[PDB]
Design an enzyme around this catalytic site. Structure first.
Site, PDB file in Angstrom:
ATOM      1  CG  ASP A 516      34.695  19.271  63.708  1.00 44.63           C
ATOM      2  OD1 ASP A 516      33.858  19.646  62.863  1.00 44.63           O
ATOM      3  OD2 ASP A 516      35.870  18.954  63.411  1.00 44.63           O
ATOM      4  CD  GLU A 545      27.434  17.192  60.395  1.00 51.73           C
ATOM      5  OE1 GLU A 545      27.066  17.067  59.208  1.00 51.73           O
ATOM      6  OE2 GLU A 545      27.566  18.300  60.956  1.00 51.73           O
TER       7      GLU A 545
HETATM    8  O1  LIG Z   1      40.920  24.344  59.266  1.00 52.23           O
HETATM    9  C1  LIG Z   1      40.896  22.949  59.005  1.00 52.23           C
HETATM   10  C2  LIG Z   1      39.703  22.575  58.154  1.00 52.23           C
HETATM   11  O2  LIG Z   1      38.582  23.355  58.625  1.00 52.23           O
HETATM   12  C3  LIG Z   1      37.353  23.092  57.954  1.00 52.23           C
HETATM   13  O3  LIG Z   1      36.941  21.764  58.110  1.00 52.23           O
HETATM   14  C4  LIG Z   1      36.501  21.453  59.447  1.00 52.23           C
HETATM   15  C5  LIG Z   1      35.723  20.150  59.417  1.00 52.23           C
HETATM   16  O4  LIG Z   1      34.584  20.369  58.547  1.00 52.23           O
HETATM   17  C6  LIG Z   1      33.751  19.210  58.403  1.00 52.23           C
HETATM   18  O5  LIG Z   1      32.692  19.546  57.574  1.00 52.23           O
HETATM   19  C7  LIG Z   1      34.549  18.062  57.778  1.00 52.23           C
HETATM   20  O6  LIG Z   1      33.725  16.912  57.653  1.00 52.23           O
HETATM   21  C8  LIG Z   1      35.758  17.737  58.656  1.00 52.23           C
HETATM   22  O7  LIG Z   1      36.550  16.741  58.025  1.00 52.23           O
HETATM   23  C9  LIG Z   1      36.596  18.999  58.882  1.00 52.23           C
HETATM   24  O8  LIG Z   1      37.640  18.724  59.804  1.00 52.23           O
HETATM   25  C10 LIG Z   1      37.499  23.401  56.457  1.00 52.23           C
HETATM   26  O9  LIG Z   1      36.292  23.074  55.780  1.00 52.23           O
HETATM   27  C11 LIG Z   1      38.654  22.588  55.868  1.00 52.23           C
HETATM   28  O10 LIG Z   1      38.849  22.949  54.509  1.00 52.23           O
HETATM   29  C12 LIG Z   1      39.941  22.837  56.663  1.00 52.23           C
HETATM   30  O11 LIG Z   1      40.971  21.981  56.190  1.00 52.23           O
END
Ligand SMILES: OC[C@H]1O[C@H](OC[C@H]2O[C@@H](O)[C@H](O)[C@@H](O)[C@@H]2O)[C@H](O)[C@@H](O)[C@@H]1O
Ligand SMILES: [Ca+2]
Ligand SMILES: [Ca+2]
Ligand SMILES: [Ca+2]
Ligand SMILES: [Ca+2]
Length: 922
Positions: A516, A545
């Site tokens: 992530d 990603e």
């Molecule tokens: O629970 C925390 C966070 O979880 C989710 O996001 C995770 C990641 O999703 C990717 O798509 C994004 O680019 C990253 O920045 C995120 O860390 C959730 O979508 C988000 O709303 C929460 O805060």
């Protein structure tokens, strides 16, 4: 030495812009051009001018200096700060035990500035090497057990042992190793299964106090319910392994690039999979073990997908997440009585929904009734569900509590080691019974919390300000990731990451990892980790990603371009955006205006779009480039008939093609984050595009991924036209909006307006497009699953679709229908296997033609006249249920494709290798 004093509040310690980067270097902008620069310290107290306005604490003299090249390379972003030298005789270990404060005063002694000090840099320079050579956690061996935790700044550390009933049975003062800063304790093998925590006595800069608290092991490999206590465990124990575990092999090879290219991923979530399946035994719904219910609709479904070409299952967070309470009595799900929800959720009990508390309905039944009157003006479904989400069992889980222990809520028994075997039983079932490899989503880029008080702050309580990335001036934990940004550029965190991956690889037999926000990690760290893991499993695959890092100032980031040629895969947003249309930031009308190749950009415009034929043809360029692996050096003819390399095709200001090999690129048109494919097509499809056409649009969009050279990736449910009722970010939208119905009644579309906090600004456009056509039913889901399996089946029907090597792709892959005279929306890709391509990779054919007619018109291809082209037997066998239904191959050799169709044609190989379809020189 003059005595520093206050002018004889605005002169007390402020901020934390001083950086103790190494044994003798302190970088701080405050002591610049200052006569008196010192580093004050206090073991158990907080530095502060006494009543006499004097800072009567011990200190060391700081003398101006120039930053060395060592510190300059380690922290490029600090190479600008004024450097200061510490005497080579200072007791670093002693000063690191308490609070250190940098103070600057004028020649007369009056203070001009005082600030806290960030010590992560000196911590690595002093203890890292020594600490890196040791192993951590509760290590249960033959001779017994050895506990080890890294806490270089702690004044005291005691190992606290607890009974099953959680009563303290012993508190052992641990032994500190001076060289590493690690603490250890050795005991007998009878401690197996025992619960424990580390009692810390350590100074925490955020609170400026020597904190006293018990913390779980960051190297924990087993935990009690809700992660309150870590537990001693030997993952090698046969009692924690399902029958035949040690002999479990990978159903799919990942050795060569050709092997890797065949990867076809299905991103799934534990609850998304079985939370709604009534054919899965009730006690296993939303559990790892649901994958073992062979007779269920869900398992049977996955089994068929596998038989048809899906090779890997990628699991959303299954490590220990923090955002779901593992104590069942504190949780209430929608299938349970509303009365239960009111007893566990005080917010519901005081809301406008309180009246349902003493009703006899389940939450689910209440949500169902609220649907009819639900609208942009009365979003009552999401209103209730938003309260439900606070105490249910649902969450994507991108909130790390413990990185190397399976999540407890997905186990039928969250207390102790039980979850370990259940998790392994699932892995075994996926590989052995479903025949698919397993990939795990990892989130090492952040922790759920930091500080000395939060329940989930583990690492930042044990070694304060070290495991988290901090702002250079305030010392505050950054939150660019979302939450508590971690510091992978720090040696001991990099080691924790690698050690963690080692366990998931060796002990849980995971075949690959998806990082992530991988770009928040130094390229060097990701590569080092891979090198260590390849030693354990030579065929392990790493990919990730992100694409919005912003950490380049601190280190070379693990980005799409920096990872070129490394073998580390990265999700490509190029073909994704071109086919889906628009971008992740779109809102309101833009959601409908920005059509993609898959939704008719240019050829079947909706009433709002302004897309030109040139803008549409550009998307087709990005799509073709992606189907060829999004290579930087791939040569194609662009929309203007110009000869271009992949790197020359623009992608919002960046070079489109960035990879060296197609295996470094993961293509996709749908994923857990952002709107599902179906919801985007619903936002973008022209009003006149009927239901049957939208299903084909879904299939055509997915065809660009499945029939492409890059690794194919897709969201669980795309084959079911999955909908989230337009929800864009459903991470905490519960079972309701994340529902996947394996009974095939519908695709969960139109089940209420999505969360208002995040999609409220889209209610207007949603109400306008939502009812354009009917909601897919069983007929449509079956039709889509058939299209989907046909595509995956075609992808694995020939090695020509997954060449793996970039040079081979360039040697065999080409395109037709290009340039300014192209028929918009028609993608025609050729793959050579003739004499001029080299060795025959497919004994049945000399070449393959992939034609995707993403347009409302029938198109005739004259390119292969007299070539004796034939429709793929797989599509012929599908008859009128094929994406190629209606395709016609005339006597002359011309091929006609109906609207919204996909055809895979082939040149039957004769007695010997034929002419094939040679790549045209450009
Ligand atoms: O629970 C925390 C966070 O979880 C989710 O996001 C995770 C990641 O999703 C990717 O798509 C994004 O680019 C990253 O920045 C995120 O860390 C959730 O979508 C988000 O709303 C929460 O805060
Ligand atoms: Ca948990
Ligand atoms: Ca939730
Ligand atoms: Ca920064
Ligand atoms: Ca051949």
């Amino acid at each position: 030495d003059v005595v520093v004093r206050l002018p004889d509040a605005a002169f007390g310690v402020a901020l934390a812009d001083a950086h103790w980067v190494d044994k003798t270097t302190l970088l701080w902008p405050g002591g610049e051009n200052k006569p008196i620069v010192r580093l004050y310290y206090s073991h158990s107290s907080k530095v502060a001018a006494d009543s006499n306005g004097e800072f009567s604490d011990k200190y060391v003299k700081l003398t101006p200096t120039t930053v060395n090249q060592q510190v300059s390379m380690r922290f490029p972003h600090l190479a600008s700060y004024p450097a200061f030298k510490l005497p080579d005789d200072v007791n670093v270990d002693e000063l690191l035990q308490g609070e250190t404060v940098a103070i600057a005063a004028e020649s007369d002694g009056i203070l001009s500035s005082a600030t806290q000090v960030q010590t992560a840099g000196v911590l690595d320079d002093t203890y890292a090497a020594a600490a890196e050579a040791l192993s951590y956690g509760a290590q249960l061996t033959d001779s017994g057990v050895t506990f080890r935790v890294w806490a270089p700044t702690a004044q005291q550390v005691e190992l606290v042992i607890y009974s099953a009933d959680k009563k303290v049975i012993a508190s052992h003062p641990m032994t500190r190793d001076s060289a590493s800063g690690a603490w250890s304790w050795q005991g007998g093998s009878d401690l197996k299964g025992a619960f424990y925590r580390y009692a810390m006595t350590v100074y925490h800069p955020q609170s400026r106090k020597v904190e006293q608290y018990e913390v779980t092991d960051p190297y924990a490999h087993s935990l009690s319910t809700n992660s309150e206590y870590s537990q001693v465990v030997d993952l090698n124990d046969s009692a924690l392994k399902p029958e035949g575990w040690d002999g479990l092999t990978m159903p799919h090879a990942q050795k060569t690039k050709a092997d890797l290219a065949k990867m076809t991923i299905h991103e799934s979530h534990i609850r998304d999979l079985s939370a709604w399946d009534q054919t899965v035994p009730a006690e296993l719904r939303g559990k790892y073990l649901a994958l073992t219910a062979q007779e269920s609709n869900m398992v049977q479904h996955l089994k068929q997908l596998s038989a048809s070409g899906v090779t890997h299952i990628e699991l959303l967070p299954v490590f220990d997440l923090a955002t779901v309470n593992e104590f069942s009595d504190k949780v209430a799900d929608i299938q349970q009585p509303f009365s239960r929800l009111c007893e566990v959720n005080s917010a519901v009990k005081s809301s406008e929904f309180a009246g349902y508390c003493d009703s006899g309905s389940t939450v689910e039944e209440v949500l169902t009734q609220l649907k009819q009157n639900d609208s942009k003006d009365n979003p009552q479904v999401q209103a209730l569900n938003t309260l439900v989400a606070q105490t249910d069992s649902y969450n994507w889980g991108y909130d790390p509590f413990h990185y190397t222990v399976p999540e407890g809520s997905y186990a039928t028994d969250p207390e102790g080691t039980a979850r370990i075997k259940e998790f392994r039983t699932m892995i075994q079932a996926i590989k052995q019974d479903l025949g698919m490899n397993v990939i795990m989503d990892v989130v090492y880029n952040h922790t759920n919390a930091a500080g000395p008080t939060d329940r989930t702050s583990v690492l930042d309580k044990i070694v304060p300000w070290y495991y988290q990335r901090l702002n250079e001036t305030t010392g505050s934990v950054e939150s660019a990731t979302c939450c508590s940004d971690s510091a992978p550029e720090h040696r001991m965190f990099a080691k924790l990451i690698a050690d963690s991956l080692a366990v998931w690889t060796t002990d849980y037999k995971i075949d690959g990892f998806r990082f992530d926000l991988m770009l928040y990690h130094p390229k060097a760290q990701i590569l080092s980790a891979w090198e260590r893991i390849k030693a354990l499993n030579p065929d392990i695959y790493f990919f990730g990603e992100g694409w919005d890092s912003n950490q380049s100032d601190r280190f070379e980031i693990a980005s799409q371009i920096n990872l070129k040629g490394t073998g580390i895969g990265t999700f490509s947003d190029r073909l994704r955006d071109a086919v889906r249309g628009g971008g992740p930031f779109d809102s309101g009308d833009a959601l409908r205006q920005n059509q993609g190749v898959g939704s008719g950009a240019g050829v079947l415009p909706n009433e709002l779009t302004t897309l030109s034929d040139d803008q549409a043809r550009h998307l087709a360029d990005l799509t073709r480039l992606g189907m060829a692996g999004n290579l930087a050096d791939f040569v194609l003819i662009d929309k203007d008939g110009a000869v271009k390399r992949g790197s020359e095709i623009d992608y919002n200001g960046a070079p489109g093609g960035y990879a060296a090999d197609p295996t470094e690129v993961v293509n996709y048109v749908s994923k857990h984050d952002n709107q599902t494919l179906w919801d985007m097509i619903s936002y973008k499809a022209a009003q006149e595009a009927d239901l049957d056409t939208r299903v084909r649009m879904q299939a055509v969009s997915l065809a660009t991924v499945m029939l492409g050279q890059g690794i194919a990736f897709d969201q669980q449910g795309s084959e079911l036209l999955r909908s989230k009722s337009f929800t864009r970010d459903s991470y905490d939208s519960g079972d309701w909006f994340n529902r996947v119905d394996y009974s095939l009644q519908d695709n969960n579309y139109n089940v209420g307006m999505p969360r208002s906090s995040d999609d409220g600004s889209n209610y207007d456009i949603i109400a306008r497009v939502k009812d354009a056509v009917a909601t897919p039913g069983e007929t449509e889901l079956k039709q889509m699953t058939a299209f989907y399996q046909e595509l995956t089946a075609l992808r694995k029907s020939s090695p020509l679709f997954t060449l793996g090597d970039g040079a081979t792709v360039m040697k065999r892959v080409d395109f037709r229908n290009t340039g300014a005279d192209q028929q918009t929306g028609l993608l025609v890709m050729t793959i050579d296997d003739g004499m001029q391509a080299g060795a025959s990779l497919d004994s049945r054919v000399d070449g393959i033609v992939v034609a995707i007619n993403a347009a409302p018109e029938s198109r005739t291809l004259q390119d292969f006249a007299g070539t004796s082209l034939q429709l793929s037997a797989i599509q012929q066998a599908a008859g009128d249920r094929s994406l190629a239904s209606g395709v016609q191959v005339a006597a002359d050799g011309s091929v006609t494709l109906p609207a919204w169709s996909v055809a895979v044609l082939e040149l039957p190989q004769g007695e010997s290798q034929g002419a094939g379809l040679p790549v045209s020189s450009k």
